[PDB]
Write a protein that binds this ligand. Structure first.
Ligand SMILES: *[C@@H]1O[C@H](CO)[C@@H](O)[C@H](O)[C@H]1NC(C)=O
Ligand SMILES: *[C@@H]1O[C@H](CO)[C@@H](O)[C@H](O)[C@H]1NC(C)=O
Ligand SMILES: *[C@@H]1O[C@H](CO)[C@@H](O)[C@H](O)[C@H]1NC(C)=O
Lengths: 273, 275, 9, 99
């Protein structure tokens, strides 16, 4: 049985590029492709692909459920068993849906979050897909209500492996492998179990510090717009501290280098008058 | 005692050739007793020794769930290692982990281990005090900072002191007849002429457990440890081991040489000669 | 018994 | 960095002609883990060949045992064929009763 794969992603926008590789008998050998509509008719009239099948630029015609067979001369058929199925979904065909987090995008380790995808357009199916090379989407049937169609994806228990940038898509009937434009991205971030920094007051300046060697600190106003970054500086007292120069309620997070979707547990809320 | 329990994790990416694979194996001393492979129909912790087969469903359920969690974590860890070393996403890489406990005769904790490597080279490892880490490079220093902030060492110490030791005791009890009684090597010496002026004396040890053994050659009571040939101890296939040690001798000096065999399955050390 | 301790890099 | 595999071909029990036995190919000290191992009867691959689960030693190098039921004879030559990324062609190590 060959191993079929799509690179970099099976979910691919129109005008993008995706390569199908069929690995069989320690080689990316000559192989034939097949769709799911009727499994034993080789596409492009029995075309035997030499190396790998680069679809570029991707059109809506490339969308579908693929399976490959590798060449195996010293065998009764001369060809291998059907490989693992790989579904190529093409996006950018409809208006984008909306993606929302409940209660929010910041999810503490071990807990769950609801990612709701909804639209005015009556999408038959919804697909949740996390940004990343070699990632498969989840599917839910759209529930119709009050003029909008929606679906709730459950994600948990929260671990770093589940953190990242999420987008949802919609598909209308008769075009299941054709997906809408992606919804606006939603960054799902895990908080903890790393120890919370302390946040205190040193015009005022809010200093958040920790004994742990966080690479940088994030300050956020509860009900604010954007978060404020500041690199942690190794102080003389061996503490790592960031000083945010400045009413409301603030919180401080610690984070490490090369780890974009994880933060420490949030600091205690700081009331500034 | 003394006895050991070890777990070995192998996590490997193989872009284009398969999805990331996680393999775990469990050992008591030299005997494998459990395994887990993420590349199956439905991945489950499975028995690999008869004396663990009668543990209840709760054991296997718990272990399977833990192994699933571990598999996910180490797939993600591969993805992380890629960012740490700024490597291509088309390459094949491997993380290896080994951890466990050494207990003594009465069955109390003597030492704890938890070491991990990336691509065959040391990455990061728990220190003897079981509260601190040793990193091999900058990426591993990042990992160290993370694990210190998350206090992983305290949890690991709690596991090694608690569950590892107790379950090791239970295992040692479960298969005592096979795990705690050593089997002495059946041994002999063979002669193989090289030329008319020299020949090879080979000392054989077969069917012994555990794997630890010493085979030495002596000329007139002195170890010829430099000009001796040793093979790796090899498994026979039935949870017992084989080993031999050879030496090249001048023709007519066979009497001068003796083979010495020490193994815990023997009451007294063994001495052998060819005739 | 294997370790229940999560080792995230 | 890569390590080439060491190979030992040997029987489980002292081999006597006509007596049922087990043939072992023990491969070790290699890195990475991807490796191909075949047991050969007069140059041809044996059908039923089982193997141990992937493990490694303290130097992080892997080891594997491949084994098969066989009957010792002097007419039939048994061997082990091992291919690894460090090997251009697969190595044939023949079974020798005194090794
Ligand atoms: C892809 O094809 C296989 C077999 O043809 C089928 O089992 C599978 O359900 C298909 N996948 C999807 C998303 O339809
Ligand atoms: C979807 O998730 C959120 C919070 O649970 C909320 O909008 C709503 O209760 C959910 N919709 C359901 C359960 O149909
Ligand atoms: C460390 O030094 C800074 C002054 O640079 C100070 O604000 C902070 O309170 C000190 N941290 C501790 C724990 O003393």
């Amino acid at each position: 049985k060959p191993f079929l794969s799509a690179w970099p992603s099976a979910v691919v926008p129109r005008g993008g590029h995706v390569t199908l590789r069929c690995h069989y008998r320690h080689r990316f050998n000559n192989f034939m492709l097949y769709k799911e509509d009727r499994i034993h008719i080789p596409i492009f009239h029995g075309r035997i692909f030499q190396e790998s099948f680069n679809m570029s630029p991707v059109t809506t015609a490339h969308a579908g459920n693929y399976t490959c067979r590798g060449s195996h001369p010293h065998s009764p058929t001369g060809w291998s068993a059907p490989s693992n199925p790989v579904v190529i979904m093409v996006t950018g065909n409809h208006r984008k849906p909306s993606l929302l987090a409940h209660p929010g995008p910041l999810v503490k380790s071990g807990e769950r979050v609801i990612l709701q995808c909804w639209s005015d357009i009556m999408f038959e199916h919804f697909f949740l897909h996390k940004e990343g090379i070699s990632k498969d989407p989840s599917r839910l049937v759209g529930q119709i209500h009050d003029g909008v169609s929606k679906a709730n994806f459950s994600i948990g228990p929260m671990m770093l492996a589940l953190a990242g940038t999420y987008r949802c898509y919609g598909s209308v009937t008769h075009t299941s492998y054709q997906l809408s434009a992606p919804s606006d991205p939603l960054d799902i971030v895990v908080t903890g179990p790393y120890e919370k920094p302390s946040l205190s007051a040193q015009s005022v300046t809010l200093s958040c510090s920790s004994r742990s060697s966080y690479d940088m600190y994030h300050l956020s106003r509860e009900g604010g717009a954007h978060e404020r970054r500041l690199p942690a500086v190794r102080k003389v007292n061996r503490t790592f501290q960031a000083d945010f120069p400045l009413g409301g309620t603030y919180r401080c997070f610690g984070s490490f280098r090369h780890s974009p979707y994880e933060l420490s547990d949030p600091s205690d809320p700081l009331l500034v008058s | 005692g003394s006895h050991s329990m070890r777990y070995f994790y192998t996590a490997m990416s193989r872009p284009g050739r398969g999805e990331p694979r996680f393999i775990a194996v469990g050992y008591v001393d030299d005997t494998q007793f459990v395994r887990f492979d993420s590349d199956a129909a439905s991945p489950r912790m499975a028995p690999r020794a008869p004396w663990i087969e009668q543990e209840g469903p709760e054991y296997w359920d718990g272990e399977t769930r833990n192994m699933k969690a571990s598999a996910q974590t180490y797939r993600e860890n591969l993805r992380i290692a890629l960012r740490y070393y700024n490597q291509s996403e088309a390459g094949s890489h491997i993380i290896q982990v080994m951890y466990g406990c050494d207990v003594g005769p009465d069955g109390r904790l003597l030492r704890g281990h938890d070491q991990s490597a990336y691509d065959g080279k040391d990455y990061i490892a728990l220190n003897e005090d079981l509260s601190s880490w040793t990193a091999a490079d900058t990426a591993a220093q990042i990992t160290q900072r993370k694990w210190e902030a998350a206090r992983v060492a305290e949890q690991l110490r709690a596991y090694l002191e608690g569950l590892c030791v107790e379950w090791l005791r239970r295992y040692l009890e479960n298969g005592k007849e096979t795990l705690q009684r050593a089997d002495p090597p059946k041994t002999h010496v063979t002669h193989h002429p090289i030329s008319d002026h020299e020949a090879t004396l080979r000392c054989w040890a077969l069917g012994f457990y555990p794997a630890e053994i010493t085979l030495t050659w002596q000329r007139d009571g002195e170890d010829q440890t430099q000009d001796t040939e040793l093979v790796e101890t090899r498994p026979a296939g039935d949870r017992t081991f084989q080993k031999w040690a050879a030496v090249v001798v001048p023709s007519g000096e066979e009497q001068r040489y003796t083979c010495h065999v020490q193994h815990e399955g023997l009451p007294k050390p063994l001495t052998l000669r060819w005739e | 018994l294997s370790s229940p301790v999560t080792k995230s890099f | 960095i890569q390590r080439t595999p060491k190979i030992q071909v040997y029987s489980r029990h002292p081999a006597e002609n006509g007596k049922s036995n087990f043939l072992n190919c023990y491969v070790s000290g290699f890195h990475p883990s991807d490796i191909e191992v075949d047991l050969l009867k007069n140059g041809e691959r044996i059908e039923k060949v089982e193997h141990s689960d992937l493990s490694f030693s303290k130097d992080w190098s892997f080891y594997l045992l491949y084994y098969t039921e066989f009957t010792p004879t002097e007419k039939d030559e048994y061997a082990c064929r091992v291919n690894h990324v460090t090997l251009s062609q697969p190595k044939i190590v023949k079974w020798d009763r005194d090794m």
